[PDB]
Design a binder for this molecule. Structure first.
Ligand SMILES: *[C@@H]1O[C@H](CO[C@@H]2O[C@@H](C)[C@@H](O)[C@@H](O)[C@@H]2O)[C@@H](O[C@@H]2O[C@H](CO)[C@@H](O[C@@H]3O[C@H](CO)[C@@H](O)[C@H](O[C@H]4O[C@H](CO)[C@@H](O)[C@H](O)[C@@H]4O)[C@@H]3O)[C@H](O)[C@H]2NC(C)=O)[C@H](O)[C@H]1NC(C)=O
Ligand SMILES: *[C@@H]1O[C@H](CO)[C@@H](O[C@@H]2O[C@H](CO)[C@@H](O[C@@H]3O[C@H](CO)[C@@H](O)[C@H](O)[C@@H]3O)[C@H](O)[C@H]2NC(C)=O)[C@H](O)[C@H]1NC(C)=O
Ligand SMILES: CC(C)CCC[C@@H](C)[C@H]1CC[C@H]2[C@@H]3CC=C4C[C@@H](OC(=O)CCC(=O)O)CC[C@]4(C)[C@H]3CC[C@]12C
Ligand SMILES: CC(C)CCC[C@@H](C)[C@H]1CC[C@H]2[C@@H]3CC=C4C[C@@H](OC(=O)CCC(=O)O)CC[C@]4(C)[C@H]3CC[C@]12C
Ligand SMILES: *[C@@H]1O[C@H](CO)[C@@H](O[C@@H]2O[C@H](CO)[C@@H](O)[C@H](O)[C@H]2NC(C)=O)[C@H](O)[C@H]1NC(C)=O
Ligand SMILES: NCCC[C@H](N)C(=O)O
Lengths: 223, 544
């Protein structure tokens, strides 16, 4: 029978930060989840600058007056100035531009490691404190030069928008780091999405390699 | 082209002279600009770096003036010790330093005075003048700076000299105002302005195109801090007057280095305190473009203090302005008499007993530079030349420490058996100094132009960086193994194999931090200097 299925993407605190709904039969609808990388960081680790931001909160930071809205009192010209000295994070539009650059650069990017749903043989990968990426080889997906892949991980994560597409979205002071999460086959045959599964996404940069924890889950009701 | 020439104030007096010639025009005007654009609240660190380098340079001068009995500018010492071409380059860089310093301090003085009286002169200039070259030339031509330069050049031509009493009075007023600024910053200012975040990225005014950066203590990163340090190096320039002072010194070669170092330390303390105050009272991105300190005082409600500051600045700037003007004709006259510059510039006029032609020409050049270019551009153009001159002096000290007194096998070079410098050792040190200078230039090029490449860890950038650094260490060791000249000196650089090399490296790095336009202006100026030397300097040299 048809249910009003809903796919929910949540931060590390298990609070719903994004969702997509539709009337479909159960275990037959597998849409491409498109949550923005910053929503996952809402109320997340301090690095992203959204530790005090509730889910569904508006993007923080003053607007770029390169943006469509035009020049306004208090605009940030950082969005035009070089991004080399900025930190990849989500607390400002120019920091989001730097995050997009890091997430799109070939020499850089992000990698995702599975959480509790990983096999016991992967238990050496560490817990949430390590974002399940304690050592190389634990990452199963994400966008980097070596293109990690897994035949058992439930999802694959890529960038939904190219740098050119995302730059103007960032300059508009909107959420502008949309991930594209596609259920792998192994995810599709799996039915434990009701309990929810979790992953750790870490930036592949020089230094901290800061990361966050996100999760995917399924809800349904009669309709 | 290396012909070599044949050659009371207390410590407190020299300290006062240096402080008066250094404090103004770098803390009252450019501190806010650096804190807003380059450094942020981390400008305090910038002033530290610019301080340390300055100190190093000063220490070199302490040795560099110790080797020559006749006190004078670094040009005189170079021309006596090392040769003619090197001395010409040093004197040309000092001429640039003095001219552009006069131009920049006149700009700062005119801007401060005009702002004090409500900016009527700026409105007049915008109404009746326009350069139509926004990308290079100044938006507003400073006619009042030209008037100031004309008046001061007229005074200097008539024979007005350094009034030590007036300098002391103005320096005391300046230091009192700076102490007031520091105390008011620590009373009204708060540390929260050093911890700003995206919540506070909103200036209460309606300014546009604001640079908020990361926020916190280091919004623009250590690259921004380094650019701010390169800009603030201008603030520490002026201690040369200690060594070049016309008045006889009680203990010249002992008081000059101590005086220079003490003046630099006092200036660093003042700059640190005042910049910390400025960035604590008001947000770095909120700092006023025209009047940063008065703007910060008004922001916290103490608008009346703007008058007090308006006094101190107008004192400091004055003491700085003359500090840039008095040496300006002296170096030109010295170079013209020696034949390196046009001989007519050396014509002392009988009516005044002063180098009238040199003073007039230098004043006109400074007035034009102040008319055409912005304060920041002039500051950078002066900083690059002063950095080159200080690097030249440090190289002179390093080379001369190992040269023999005025009249091969790898093991021999590595381990010279001679107890005292031989001509072979002197040639080895000269070659090592040249190689080390080129290698340091390469390192700075890789560390700036290839900065992102090094951050990316590309094979070529890292390879060149490691090779250049290790070879710099190797050449420094080569110089180290050479015996030092036993000629006793009243003052010496403590670590002669390392300290001059570090001074050169820091100076060249700071020059690399400067913008492309500054480098183009410096290149054309050096082209003019080389044209003058090769066309006229070599043939009309007095020692030829
Ligand atoms: C099919 O089911 C979806 C999902 O319902 C939600 O999830 C279920 C698991 C269950 O917990 C439900 O109780 C829960 O609502 C239905 O979509 C929801 O529709 C309602 C009706 O408007 C939305 O109500 C909210 O109303 C707010 C007004 O104060 C408004 O601000 C909200 O918009 C903002 O917040 C939501 C989430 O809070 C966010 O998704 C928006 O983008 C926006 O920021 C919102 O309108 C629920 O929020 C909806 N839940 C969603 C979208 O997840 C859907 O109606 C249902 N279909 C049928 C036919 O019944
Ligand atoms: C994430 O990626 C998806 C897919 O690349 C983006 O969806 C795309 O959005 C654009 C604009 O919203 C759609 O273009 C539209 O096409 C319709 C015809 O279908 C046309 O009438 C409109 O005028 C417009 O040109 C595009 O079709 C759509 N693609 C898909 C596959 O749905 C999405 O915008 C990206 N961002 C986010 C936050 O999801
Ligand atoms: C139509 C004109 C007159 C407009 C009004 C401007 C003048 C009244 C101002 C502009 C610059 C001023 C001068 C700027 C600097 C100084 C140096 C100052 O002396 C020192 O600072 C001594 C310290 C040292 O010698 O280092 C004495 C005042 C004086 C001549 C100022 C006197 C008043 C001047 C000429
Ligand atoms: C006065 C005597 C007793 C001590 C002299 C010490 C100096 C030789 C040291 C102290 C601090 C040093 C500086 C500290 C930091 C740097 C930054 C460094 O560059 C970077 O780290 C760039 C990093 C980036 O790319 O972000 C280049 C050397 C420099 C200027 C150093 C040069 C040498 C300095 C001036
Ligand atoms: C920057 O903004 C933050 C957030 O508004 C300010 O912090 C708050 O300041 C108010 C003062 O009115 C306090 O009542 C709150 O308790 C503060 N909250 C937090 C989380 O700090 C901060 O003061 C602002 N900084 C400046 C320099 O104005
Ligand atoms: N008086 C010499 C010119 C440079 C000086 N440090 C200044 O701040 O202007």
């Amino acid at each position: 029978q048809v249910y009003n299925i809903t796919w929910e993407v949540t931060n590390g605190d298990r609070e719903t930060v994004w969702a997509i709904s539709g009337n479909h039969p159960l275990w037959t609808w597998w849409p491409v989840l498109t949550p923005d990388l910053c929503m996952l960081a809402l109320s997340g680790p301090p690095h992203w600058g959204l530790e005090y931001q509730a889910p569904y909160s508006s993007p923080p930071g003053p607007p770029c007056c390169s943006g469509s809205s035009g020049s306004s009192a208090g605009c940030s010209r950082d969005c035009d100035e070089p991004l080399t000295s900025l930190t990849p994070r989500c607390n400002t539009a120019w920091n989001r531009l730097k995050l997009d650059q890091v997430t799109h650069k070939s020499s850089e990017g992000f990698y995702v490691c599975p959480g509790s749903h990983r096999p016991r043989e992967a238990k050496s990968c560490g817990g949430p404190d390590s974002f399940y990426c304690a050592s190389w080889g634990c990452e199963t997906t994400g966008r980097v030069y070596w293109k990690p892949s897994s035949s058992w991980d439930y999802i694959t994560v890529d960038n939904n928008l190219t740098t050119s597409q995302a730059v103007q979205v960032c300059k508009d002071n909107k959420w502008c780091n949309p991930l594209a999460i596609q259920f792998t086959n192994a995810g599709k045959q799996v039915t434990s999405w009701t309990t929810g599964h979790y992953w750790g996404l870490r930036l592949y940069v020089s230094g901290r390699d800061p990361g966050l924890t996100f999760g995917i889950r399924l809800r349904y009701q009669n309709l | 082209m290396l012909r070599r020439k044949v050659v009371c104030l207390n410590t407190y007096d020299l300290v006062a002279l240096g402080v008066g010639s250094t404090l103004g025009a770098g803390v009252y005007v450019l501190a806010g600009a650096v804190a807003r654009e380059n450094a942020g609240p981390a400008i305090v660190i910038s002033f530290l770096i610019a301080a340390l380098a300055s100190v190093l340079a000063g220490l070199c001068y302490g040795e560099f003036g110790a080797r020559v009995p006749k006190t004078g500018s670094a040009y005189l010492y170079s021309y006596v010790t090392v040769g003619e071409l090197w001395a010409f380059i040093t004197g040309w860089n000092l001429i640039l330093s003095y001219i552009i310093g006069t131009s920049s301090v006149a700009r700062a003085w005119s801007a401060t005075f005009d702002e004090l009286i409500g900016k009527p002169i700026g409105e007049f200039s915008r109404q009746h003048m326009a350069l139509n070259a926004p990308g290079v030339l100044a938006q507003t031509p400073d006619i009042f700076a030209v008037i100031i330069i004309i008046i001061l050049t007229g005074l200097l031509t008539l024979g007005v000299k350094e009034s030590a009493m007036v300098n002391k009075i103005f320096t005391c007023i300046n230091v009192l105002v700076l102490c007031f600024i520091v105390v008011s910053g620590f009373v009204k200012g708060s540390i929260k302005n050093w911890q700003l975040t995206e919540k506070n990225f909103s200036c209460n005014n309606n300014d546009t195109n604001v640079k908020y950066g990361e926020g916190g203590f280091m919004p623009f990163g250590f690259s921004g801090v380094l650019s701010g340090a390169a800009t603030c190096f201008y603030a520490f320039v002026g201690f040369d007057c200690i060594a070049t002072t016309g008045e006889e010194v009680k203990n010249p070669q002992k008081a000059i280095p101590v005086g220079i170092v003490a003046s630099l330390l006092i200036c660093f303390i003042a700059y640190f305190g005042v910049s910390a105050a400025l960035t604590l009272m008001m947000p770095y991105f909120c700092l006023d473009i025209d009047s940063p300190l008065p703007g910060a005082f008004k922001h916290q409600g103490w608008e009346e203090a703007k008058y007090a500051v308006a006094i101190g600045s107008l004192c400091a700037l004055s003491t700085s302005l003359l500090g840039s003007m008095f040496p300006m004709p002296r170096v030109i006259y010295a170079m013209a008499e020696d034949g390196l510059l046009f001989k007519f510039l050396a014509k002392i006029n009988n009516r005044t007993k002063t180098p009238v032609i040199a003073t007039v020409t230098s004043g006109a050049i400074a007035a034009v530079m102040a008319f055409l270019f912005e304060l920041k551009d002039l500051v950078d153009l002066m900083s690059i030349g002063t950095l080159l001159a200080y690097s030249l002096v440090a190289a002179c000290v390093l080379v001369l420490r190992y040269q023999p007194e005025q009249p091969f096998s790898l093991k021999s070079i590595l381990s010279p058996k001679n107890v005292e410098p031989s001509k072979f050792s002197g040639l080895i040190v000269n070659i090592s100094a040249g190689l080390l200078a080129a290698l340091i230039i390469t390192v700075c090029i890789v560390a700036v132009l290839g900065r992102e490449a090094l951050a990316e860890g590309t094979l070529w950038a890292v390879f060149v960086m490691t090779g250049s650094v290790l070879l710099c260490m190797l050449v420094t060791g080569i110089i180290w193994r050479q015996p030092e000249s036993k000629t006793k000196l009243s003052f010496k650089v403590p670590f002669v194999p390392v300290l001059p090399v570090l001074s050169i490296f820091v100076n060249i790095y700071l020059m690399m931090q400067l913008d492309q336009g500054t480098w183009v202006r410096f290149a054309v100026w050096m082209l003019i200097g080389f044209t003058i030397y090769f066309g006229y300097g070599i043939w009309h040299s007095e020692e030829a």
